[PDB]
């Protein structure tokens, strides 16, 4: 799990540098992996560590994706790119929503386990980060509203 996630963020910059079509696909694969991780969500401590990993650079990456989406609405289509890009956007939307309901129960439990302190910091530091920084996601939502293509709009409103 560590190897793939590390590769994927690096590749996304790597994907962008070479071949827009092939970078996008890698990003879509990463989004799929994230979705799988969400579905999946000693052992409890490992889960807490994973939650901590999920909650600053990773948060920024989602923001970068949102910025790409804001760029995206204006130009391209590119449906195959759009599906993968669209799918990635949907995954980003869903993970925060799916994660948040899970996260509040999850984070408190992690804190209880800590009675670990660093992971708790994620509860503290992670919470501060979440508010954002709101604008970039919001712009993407506005673009989705302008598009009126459906979907994306639900995840944006939720």
């Amino acid at each position: 799990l560590q190897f793939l996630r590390d590769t994927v963020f690096l590749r996304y910059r790597t994907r962008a540098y070479r071949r827009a079509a092939e970078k996008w696909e890698v990003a879509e694969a990463v989004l799929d992996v994230f979705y799988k991780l969400l579905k999946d969500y000693a052992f409890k401590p490992p889960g807490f560590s994973l939650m901590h990993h999920l909650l600053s650079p990773m948060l920024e990456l989602c923001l970068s994706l949102m910025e790409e989406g804001v760029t995206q609405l204006d130009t391209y289509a590119p449906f195959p790119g759009k599906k993968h890009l669209e799918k990635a956007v949907a995954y980003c939307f869903m993970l925060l929503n799916l994660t948040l309901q899970k996260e509040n129960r999850f984070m408190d439990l992690l804190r209880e386990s800590h009675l670990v302190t660093p992971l708790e910091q994620l509860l503290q530091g992670i919470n501060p980060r979440s508010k954002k920084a709101d604008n970039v996601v919001n712009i993407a939502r506005y673009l989705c509203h302008g598009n009126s293509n459906a979907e994306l709009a639900f995840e944006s409103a939720k």
């Binding site: 000693a42 052992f43 401590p45 490992p46 560590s49």
Partner: protein
Amino acid sequence: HLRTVGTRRQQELVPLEKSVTHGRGSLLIDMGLFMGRSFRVGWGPNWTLVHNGDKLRLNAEEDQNMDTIDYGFLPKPTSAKSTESKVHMEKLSLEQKSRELQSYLMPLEIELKNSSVDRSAQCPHFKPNAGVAAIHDYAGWVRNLSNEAGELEAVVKQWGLTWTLCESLWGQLKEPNEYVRNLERRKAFSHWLAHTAEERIEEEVSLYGPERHVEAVFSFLTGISDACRLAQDHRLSLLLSQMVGSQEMRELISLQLVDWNKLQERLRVFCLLSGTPVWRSSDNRSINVCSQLDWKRTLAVHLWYMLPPTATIAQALRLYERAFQEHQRDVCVHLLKLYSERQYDLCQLLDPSSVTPDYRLSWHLWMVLQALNYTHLSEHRQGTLHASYAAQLENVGLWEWAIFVLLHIPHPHIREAGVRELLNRQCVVRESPESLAKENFLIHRLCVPAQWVHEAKAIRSRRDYLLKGHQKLVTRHLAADASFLGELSNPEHCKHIQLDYIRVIDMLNLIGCELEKLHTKVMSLCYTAKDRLAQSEMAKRVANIL
């Protein structure tokens, strides 16, 4: 009871061992999580404990394979191990190879024209004849043609020199006729010695000259007119021409010059014309030369000057030989020692002779000498040794010559029972599978005539037919063959041998199937076998349908 007590002691040790293991788990137990840096532990002991349990007092102790297995090989080895791999993929080439190179088919074939054989109603034999002459010719022409290649080098030259010192000397030494024969042997050996100490004196003495300084004058003398011309010491020049002269000049010039020097690259020249260069410790010059020069270079001096009596050359040679000492394996040297010998005494030196031998040359050498009467070799240990060496040489397809030798060697029997077994192995299957062509027929032809062809063919069939055997089991074969000519041949073989019911059925077939079955039943009277016959008939019907 003692063993039981030891087990009781062994059992106690095990309990102690168990306690120690428990302590290790107790002391070594490691519990880091979720993920922790790895730490040392006695992980290995647990793994060894299971093995010890599998091995399991006295019994377990003397029941643990020290390794522990040994693999025995025929032609030739196999592999084995236990163990760093337990098989080795040997790349053919490795160490031993000189023997193989020396025994390149030809070293055998050529010798076969000379050996001859006794053709009879069965296994033949061998015969002797101008053996020496034969060996001389082959070694001659062969050696000459060999003196032209492009690889190895050093090795080839050494081999050639050894062969020349072996066969050469042998022949050279196989009332004025004795005087003339010694002059002729001395004449052949002299130049021979020079050629031997060549290349070494060749480029070597070359530089020596084109270099500096003295000594060379002595080295040219070991090689005379060109040396004198290059040197051109007027008085020394006249004395130098007395070399090659066995004349009683020796003593005079010897002592007188030494005395003159005492009263007062020249004394060494005088030591040579004295004719006793090394054994005369009085001059103390040509012994001390042993560190400087090859033993072969010092031999050449003895052979060339030792003295006019044409036997004294060999004398002094043997001398300097048994003389050297620094602080055995020189082949070319050991041939000289063999040559310097006389005969008889067979009971010791005949005994290192085996050392030397231990391949094909040694065999041929002993055989010619024994047959010729010059050296009656003997007999069974020497033959055992030749037999494995010849078999090692077959491995790569040396079988026919070895078989012939085995037949001739005997003796007078028992060997045949072994040679026949070897032939059977040779054609058990692979013989029948590798011979399935034209390569087998020639080999079969080559071996001394015997009715061994049917025997080899039959073995091949068994591994993988009835007609070949002719040239219960037969019934089974008939059932499989529920082609026609072969079946007829099998029937003929059965008749020759004379299942009776089956034979009757076969006769009926030769003369329908149901009638044959009835005949078989009648034969049985005067059934699983019947069922088998029915199955064979069904198979035949299937074949007909196909």
